[PDB]
Symmetry: D2
Subunit: 115 residues, 4 copies
Amino acid sequence: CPLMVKVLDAVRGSPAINVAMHVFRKAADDTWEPFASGKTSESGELHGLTTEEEFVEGIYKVEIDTKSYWKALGISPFHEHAEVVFTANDSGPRRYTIAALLSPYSYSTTAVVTN
Amino acid sequence: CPLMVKVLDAVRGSPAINVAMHVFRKAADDTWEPFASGKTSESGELHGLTTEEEFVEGIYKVEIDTKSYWKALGISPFHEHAEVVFTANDSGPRRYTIAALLSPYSYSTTAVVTN
Amino acid sequence: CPLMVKVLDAVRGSPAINVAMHVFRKAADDTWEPFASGKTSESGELHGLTTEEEFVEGIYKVEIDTKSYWKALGISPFHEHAEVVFTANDSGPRRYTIAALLSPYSYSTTAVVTN
Amino acid sequence: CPLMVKVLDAVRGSPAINVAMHVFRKAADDTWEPFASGKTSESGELHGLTTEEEFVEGIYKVEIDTKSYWKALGISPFHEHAEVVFTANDSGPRRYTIAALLSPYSYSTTAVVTN
């Protein structure tokens, strides 16, 4: 499990559950090719997006549909989605956890890259 | 204006208006002595708390009452307040802007220090 | 000044100066058309990007090149850039301040929207 | 395990390891009584601070010594420590995770309160 995503809700103080997201990998034509997708679990986590063999060096984009999440709660959000764009590099550690902390008008994202 | 505090509301995407705060300074006996206090304006800023002459080297605490802010908006939040504790003017006089970004279960605080 | 962007450096506690960014607007064909661009000033702010007449209803993307910022400081950061994507002026004209707080492995973005 | 603390380093994109913290509970005299303490593990987490029987309703303060952490890395921090002050309430969910995301000039803290 080289890539995991964890999403938290700063309004309710809870995991953000059932949040959809799509991952894309940049191709040579400089367009985003679909790579992986899913919805967060009851822990706010999405596991199993890819495998070590499939996740090679490259530029990846994680698009988290935050707008649908807030609309389901009845709170008017600012952003269309939260996007996280990064290069995977083999000199660095093996595992990438992308964390996102969501508020209606604000979000933060942090990468925890470990061995 | 050597010390300014700016407070923002991450739920509404707005300045946080009428937020009370109290500033304290550590005394020689290691107690917190009252220093200055005020409330944020319609811009979410609190200016005029002190002067260059009065704000001497020391350890200062800014206590922002976030709980009353959220309760007035109908929200029961997690934190009693947001505390910011720092040494000031150790190297000579500086201008300090303390920023706080508020959500019911989360907050962030950042210092911008200029010379 | 209907759109302003403010960028801060959480490592140094300073405005993030000379940070490039490009703004795009979604076209009728669902592509991102160039809208405006610039670099932050010594205050970490970028003003004058557009006018009330030019900034019409639409979906906008602000792409802040954080990677070049960190590399110039000797830091190899996680993200390629920080993207902020939002619908603007849906309810009529508003003033938008997009704030970004930068660390090498983490960033936050907040919108302050006033009328 | 009703109370856990998780600390992340936003500069290095890693758990914040060996971070000391002290927890206090407010007494009737309105002073902070020592309650629990420890250092974060290699995962950046501190478990086992208290038990369900001992953690009763009350006002608690978690003081995280962020200054010593940055000083060990050779980066000049702004804050003396990061403080998280909150009321434990039995009407809410059982488990409290206090998360802290650290930068030298900025930190955020979030409570995830779950069942």
